[PDB]
Amino acid sequence: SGFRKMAFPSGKVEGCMVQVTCGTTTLNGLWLDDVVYCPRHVICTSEDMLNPNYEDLLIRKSNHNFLVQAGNVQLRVIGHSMQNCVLKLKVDTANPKTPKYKFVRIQPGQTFSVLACYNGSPSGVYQCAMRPNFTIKGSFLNGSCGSVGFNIDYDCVSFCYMHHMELPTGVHAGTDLEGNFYGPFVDRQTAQAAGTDTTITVNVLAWLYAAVINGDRWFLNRFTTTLNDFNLVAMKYNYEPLTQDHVDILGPLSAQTGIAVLDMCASLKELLQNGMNGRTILGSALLEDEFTPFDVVRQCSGVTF
Amino acid sequence: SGFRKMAFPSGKVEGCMVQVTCGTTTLNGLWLDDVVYCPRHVICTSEDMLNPNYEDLLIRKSNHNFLVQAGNVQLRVIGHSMQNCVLKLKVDTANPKTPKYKFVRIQPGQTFSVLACYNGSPSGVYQCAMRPNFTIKGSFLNGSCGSVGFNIDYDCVSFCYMHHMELPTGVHAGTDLEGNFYGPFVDRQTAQAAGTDTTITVNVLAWLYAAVINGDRWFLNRFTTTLNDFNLVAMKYNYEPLTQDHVDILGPLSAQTGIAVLDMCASLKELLQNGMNGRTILGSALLEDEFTPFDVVRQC
Ligand SMILES: O=C(Nc1cncc2ccccc12)[C@@H]1CCOc2cc(F)c(Cl)cc21
Ligand SMILES: O=C(Nc1cncc2ccccc12)[C@@H]1CCOc2cc(F)c(Cl)cc21
């Protein structure tokens, strides 16, 4: 029993964290095979970030300008190139701890574990979701750039995020491992704002199923709804529309608990129109939206890595 | 910026997880140097659960009864001994991934990361606090016994918990790595109940400081209180009494935010009296008590 916000074991990713220093900037790099990936803004000083021409800044750099440190051993950079907002530093040593891995781009609503690092050293692991506005509500301090987000599928690490910056509201923005930003954000010191965030409806439904699995069932009601009527109500409370794909993904949880998706939708609908009435669900007074249906199945069944 | 429930990186502990099988029971073991630590209840049968005599059950066991598996390699048990409720299986191979480590017994209110494992394989990492009633509100399924709780302050792992059982209310009980249970619990299937749980007051205060550091101020007020008046109010809400030790530990956060401890105590009293009025603190509608003052300083 119990339901916790749970991250993937971080070991396979810790063995890849290095420190990348270029001039006065020090941040984190991800060492996989003979390549170290890090944010391209490491090549920027103060003036540069205001209006940066990364291609021109990188052409002025040499391999020796990049100081890469893996543990207490300095790696020698033998090549450098840029792929979108990520800088790829070719090194002369392949990481002996390189796990089986893939670079994946996730969609809003998807969750992942973040290994927050400082000076190439892992300091914490936490779970989060890619918000519908493409930000993450992370916990990052100065020096955390280059920290990565990942999922594990069997023994394969899927790297999906690399931390680049903190927006004025305290939320975070970054890219996939190919340097493409999640969201309408740029790696430049300029006025940027995240769009109005919405609630990940399919994830709230999955968490309501986790609560029923754990014996917390007061919010259940006799009612059901159409997907169209539910979406009309959901739009009014800044909840993402629920698609037939989402109803299908919730299928196993529906079968396990005996509560149809549209039956659970009518419970969520009443929760939005009337509140929790002084009650909690899984020890929470707010509806949690950072657990996907897969996360609920994984945690409530005990899948290992 | 931002404030998350954050666990320590689990890598140093994953390299220590092994599977321990005794007859029909399979659970997790912690392999450090040439010793595998696991709950002694792995040696129990069906009839030896209501009132097992562990000393007598262990004397009837031989090294070849214990099957230890580290990854896809079977380890050879060359000795066995018991220390309180923990079984110690001496093996013929020292774990090459043994990190710098210590065994520490924690106090209620202290937090730690849990690496939940099944069949010696890590499945998840989460952050927990030792409740004032000495249980943990974990997330554990059958087979999770032997999963450990730890903290990693620097490069040294302080193992503080090993999971033993789930109580009837769904909360969990276990021991330090010397086999001593946290709480008035025994590793028997006898009638056991956790005491009424209370809120870790010092941790809520630390989290209110984390919120101020992150730009939350709506809950602040112009009041201060005495420690005695605060304790009289807080205890009516099933909150733990706040001691002078707790006021002292909150000192650096008080200095950093410019809000005295007793000033923050008066904010907490008002939060308890009014509720949150539709507002949240650090994205939460309830007062969080699983962040210690040390966790807040470290994360912020
Ligand atoms: O965001 C930045 N680093 C931080 C990241 N995460 C968390 C933080 C918390 C506090 C202070 C910095 C934090 C850097 C420095 C500030 O300016 C920029 C601007 C940029 F366009 C980019 Cl791509 C990066 C940065
Ligand atoms: O609690 C137990 N293991 C579990 C742990 N955590 C989570 C669970 C979730 C579901 C089912 C078992 C779970 C075992 C089996 C049940 O009875 C006992 C009794 C005992 F005295 C001891 Cl020391 C252990 C156990």
The minimum-distance atom of ligand 2 relative to the CA of B145 is 5
Contacts of B75 (CB under 8 A, 6+ apart): B18, B31, B36, B68, B69, B91, B92, B93
- The 3 state secondary structure assigned to A216-231 is CCCCCCCCCCCHHHHH
In this complex, which of A4, A166, A285 lies closest to B126 when CB atoms are compared?
A4
Backbone conformation region of residue A24, classed left if phi is above 0, alpha if psi is from -120 to 50, else beta: alpha
Measured between CA atoms, the residue of chain B closest to residue A13 is B11
Question: What CA–CA distance (Å, rounded) separates B35 from B14?
Answer: 16
Question: What CA–CA distance (Å, rounded) separates B235 from A249?
Answer: 45
B140 contacts in A (CB within 8 Å)? Answer: 1-2
CB B59 within 8 A of CB B14: no
Helical segments of chain A, H only: 11-14, 46-50, 54-59, 201-213, 227-236, 244-249, 251-257, 261-274, 293-301
Question: What CA–CA distance (Å, rounded) separates B288 from B281?
Answer: 9
Between chain A and chain B, how many beta carbons pairs sit less than 8 Å apart? 135
Q: Give the 3-state secondary structure of residue B42.
A: helix
CB B285 within 8 A of CB B219: no
Question: What CA–CA distance (Å, rounded) separates A173 from A185?
Answer: 7
Nearest to B246 by CA among B257, B258, B254, B237: B254
The token duo for B233 is 């109010």
Nearest CA to ligand 1 atom 9: A141
A4 contacts in B (CB within 8 Å)? Answer: 124, 126-128, 138-139
Question: What CA–CA distance (Å, rounded) separates B4 from B298?
Answer: 12
CB B156 within 8 A of CB B100: yes
The token duo for A136 is 């993450």
Final resolution, Å? 2.0
CB B99 within 8 A of CB B85: no
Question: What CA–CA distance (Å, rounded) separates B113 from B88?
Answer: 23
**Cβ–Cβ below 8 Å for A304 and B3:** no
Question: Residue A119, Cβ neighbours under 10 Å: how many?
Answer: 15
Q: Identify the helix (H) or strand (E) that includes residue A18.
A: strand A17-22
Q: Residue A28 forms beta bridges with which residues?
A: A19
The token duo for B175 is 């021991």
Question: What CA–CA distance (Å, rounded) separates A207 from A7?
Answer: 16
Q: Give the 3-state secondary structure of residue A113.
A: strand
For β-strands B77-83 and B86-91, DSSP reports them as antiparallel
Distance of CA B264 from the midpoint of ligand 1 (Å)? 30
Does ligand 1 come within 6 angstroms of the Cβ of A166? yes
A14 contacts in B (CB within 8 Å)? Answer: 9, 11
Q: Residue A35 forms beta bridges with which residues?
A: A32, A90
Nearest CA to ligand 1 atom 14: A165
Cα-flanking dihedrals φ and ψ of residue A242, to 5°? -95, 125
Q: Residue A114 forms beta bridges with which residues?
A: A126, A149
Question: Residue A45, Cβ neighbours under 10 Å: how many?
Answer: 12
Instruction: Kindly compute the dihedral angle of the four CA atoms of residues A135, A141, A142, A148, in this order, to the nearest 10 degrees.
Output: -60
The token duo for A56 is 């021109």
Question: What CA–CA distance (Å, rounded) separates B158 from B50?
Answer: 32
Cα–Cα distances in Å, from A30 out to A77, A147, A155, A183, B111?
Answer: 14, 8, 18, 22, 29
Q: Give the 3-state secondary structure of residue B169.
A: coil
Q: Give the 3-state secondary structure of residue A136.
A: strand
CB A36 within 8 A of CB A88: yes
In this structure, what DSSP letter does residue B198 have? -
In this complex, which of A171, A280, A299 lies closest to B139 when CB atoms are compared?
A299
For β-strands A66-70 and A35-39, DSSP reports them as unpaired
What is the maximum span of chain B, computed from C-alpha positions, in angstroms? 68
**Cβ–Cβ below 8 Å for B124 and A172:** no
Select from 2.40.10.10, 3.40.50.150, 3.40.50.9100, 2.40.50.1040 the CATH code of A15-99. 2.40.10.10
Question: What CA–CA distance (Å, rounded) separates B124 from B118?
Answer: 10
Q: B31: burial class by Cβ within 10 Å (0-12, 13-18, 19+)?
A: buried
Backbone conformation region of residue B125, classed left if phi is above 0, alpha if psi is from -120 to 50, else beta: beta
Q: Tally the C-alpha atoms within 13 A of residue B202's C-alpha that lie toward its C-beta.
A: 23
Distance of CA B280 from the midpoint of ligand 2 (Å)? 36
A286 contacts in B (CB within 8 Å)? Answer: 280, 283-285
Question: What CA–CA distance (Å, rounded) separates B263 from B220?
Answer: 8
- The DSSP-derived string for B97-121 is T--EEEE----TT-EEEEEEEETTE
Question: What CA–CA distance (Å, rounded) separates B109 from B98?
Answer: 28
The token duo for B148 is 């450990």
Does ligand 1 come within 6 angstroms of the Cβ of B2? no
In this structure, what DSSP letter does residue A170 have? S
Residue pointed to by tokens 């692991």: A125
- Tally the residues of chain A: 305
Nearest to A85 by CA among A63, A54, A116, A48: A54
**Cβ–Cβ below 8 Å for B124 and A7:** yes
Measured between CA atoms, the residue of chain B closest to residue A283 is B286
Cα–Cα distances in Å, from A31 out to A92, A158, B189?
Answer: 12, 14, 49
Our CA angle for B83, B87, B92, nearest 5°, is 115
CB B82 within 8 A of CB B43: no
**A227-236 helix and A261-274 helix, angle to the nearest 10 degrees:** 30
* One-letter amino acid for residue A216 of the chain: D
**Cβ–Cβ below 8 Å for A305 and B118:** no
Q: Looking at the domain covering A198-301, what would its CATH class be?
A: mainly alpha
Q: Distance from B170 to chain A by nearest Cα, in Å? A: 5
Q: Candidates B165, B175, B182, B187: which one to mutate for ligand 2, based on the most atoms within 8 Å of Cβ?
A: B165
**B15-99 and B198-300, same CATH topology:** no
For β-strands B73-75 and B66-70, DSSP reports them as antiparallel
Q: Identify the helix (H) or strand (E) that includes residue A76.
A: none
**Cβ–Cβ below 8 Å for B2 and A139:** yes
Q: Candidates B40, B166, B171: which one to mutate for ligand 2, based on the most atoms within 8 Å of Cβ?
A: B166
Q: Give the 3-state secondary structure of residue B30.
A: strand
Backbone conformation region of residue A146, classed left if phi is above 0, alpha if psi is from -120 to 50, else beta: left
Question: What CA–CA distance (Å, rounded) separates A274 from B292?
Answer: 34
CB A206 within 8 A of CB A253: yes
Which of B1, B12, B156 to mutate: most A Cβ within 10 Å? B1
In this structure, what DSSP letter does residue B190 have? S
The token duo for B100 is 């710098």
Spans of all domains in chain A: 1-14+100-197, 15-99, 198-301
In this complex, which of A12, A139, A305 lies closest to B6 when CB atoms are compared?
A139
Q: Which residues of A are catalytic?
A: 41, 145
Question: What CA–CA distance (Å, rounded) separates B245 from A146?
Answer: 39
Select from 1.10.1840.10, 3.30.70.60, 1.10.357.10, 1.10.3720.10 the CATH code of B198-300. 1.10.1840.10
**Cβ–Cβ below 8 Å for A6 and B126:** yes
Does ligand 1 come within 6 angstroms of the Cβ of A164? yes
Nearest to A37 by CA among A90, A77, A79: A90
CB A284 within 8 A of CB B285: yes
Neighbour-count burial for B71-81, b at 16+ CB within 10 Å, e otherwise: eeeebebeebe
Cα Rg for chain B, rounded, in angstroms?
Answer: 21
Cα–Cα distances in Å, from A235 out to A164, A201, A290?
Answer: 31, 10, 19
Nearest CA to ligand 1 atom 3: A165
CATH of domain A1-14+100-197: 2.40.10.10
Q: Give the 3-state secondary structure of residue A36.
A: strand
Instruction: Kindly compute the dihedral angle of the four CA atoms of residues B116, B118, B119, B125, in this order, to the nearest 10 degrees.
Output: -30
Which of B4, B156, B295 to mutate: most A Cβ within 10 Å? B4
In this structure, what DSSP letter does residue A34 have? T
For β-strands B156-166 and B100-103, DSSP reports them as parallel
Which of A113, A118, A139 to mutate: most B Cβ within 10 Å? A139
Q: Distance from A213 to chain B by nearest Cα, in Å? A: 12
CB B213 within 8 A of CB B282: no
Contacts of B72 (CB under 8 A, 6+ apart): none
Q: Which residues of B are catalytic?
A: 41, 145
Question: What CA–CA distance (Å, rounded) separates A16 from A281?
Answer: 38
